[PDB]
């Protein structure tokens, strides 16, 4: 039997296209966007869904001062909350 399906569904993109060129002092520095994504993923994967963790990432980046980032959530076709349920 045949059923109908959306061709594009259940996507979420999270992008930083805010300029991020290499630092003069300590060039082997990790991207702050990635570092901050990881810190929020580590802390909030248990309690928040990804759509929310991406917001929390943004909220933490609200005030520019050093390395200024404002990453967008894009192309969202999520129909449900995606909870990572760490260790389940």
């Amino acid at each position: 039997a045949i059923k109908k399906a959306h061709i594009e569904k259940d996507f979420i993109a999270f992008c930083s296209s805010t300029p991020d060129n290499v630092s003069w002092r300590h060039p082997t520095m990790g991207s702050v966007f990635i570092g901050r994504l990881i810190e929020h993923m580590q802390e909030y994967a248990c309690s928040c869904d990804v759509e929310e963790i991406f917001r929390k990432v943004r909220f933490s980046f609200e005030q520019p001062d050093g390395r200024a980032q404002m990453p967008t959530t894009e192309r969202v076709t999520l129909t449900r909350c995606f909870y990572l349920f760490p260790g389940h």
Binding site: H6, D10, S16, T18, T28, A45, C46, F85
Partner: protein, 167 residues
């Protein structure tokens, strides 16, 4: 990886307030989660992305800790990235997985993500539109109904995205 774990009471505290508004997850014993990292550090004619080794270490480790077998591919052309994404879409582990993560890290422009052979004169670009197409329901039926998280680090070569204002 220091991922704060989810307790059983806290898990069902989540499962209760929002019922059928949460993506189902497969059992830990027999799920085969996959995640793909493509990271371009060395380029033909555009600046070396140093400290990407730290971004790879970080993301792999994290994704691994969320239960994903992580592939890591380095310094690819847009044609190579496309092919690599095609292979990933037809991996059978997806049929027995509940989700996936894609991570791209490179130099960005208007069109999208820079390949290694890229130059402003002879462009080598993979476009975001193409990433989604290879992972959609049609061209990837195994991941259908399952969350696909794409994470892109595509810094555009512009002036800082900040402005000064009088307060």
């Amino acid at each position: 990886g220091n991922v704060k774990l989810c307790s059983l009471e806290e898990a069902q505290r989540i499962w209760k307030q929002k019922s059928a508004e949460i993506y189902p997850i497969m059992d830990k014993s027999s799920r085969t989660r996959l995640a793909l990292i493509i990271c371009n550090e060395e380029f033909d004619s555009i600046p070396r992305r140093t400290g990407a080794e730290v971004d790879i270490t970080g993301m792999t480790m994290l994704l691994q800790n969320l239960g994903y077998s992580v592939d890591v591919k380095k310094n690819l052309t847009a044609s190579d990235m496309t092919t690599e994404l095609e292979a990933f879409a037809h991996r059978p582990e997806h049929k027995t997985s509940d989700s996936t993560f894609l991570v791209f890290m490179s130099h960005g422009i208007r069109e999208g993500i820079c390949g290694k052979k890229h130059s402003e004169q002879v462009p080598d670009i993979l476009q975001l539109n193409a990433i989604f197409n290879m992972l959609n329901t049609k061209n990837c039926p195994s991941l259908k109904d399952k969350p696909k998280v794409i994470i892109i680090q595509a810094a555009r070569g512009d002036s800082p995205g900040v402005v000064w204002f009088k307060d």
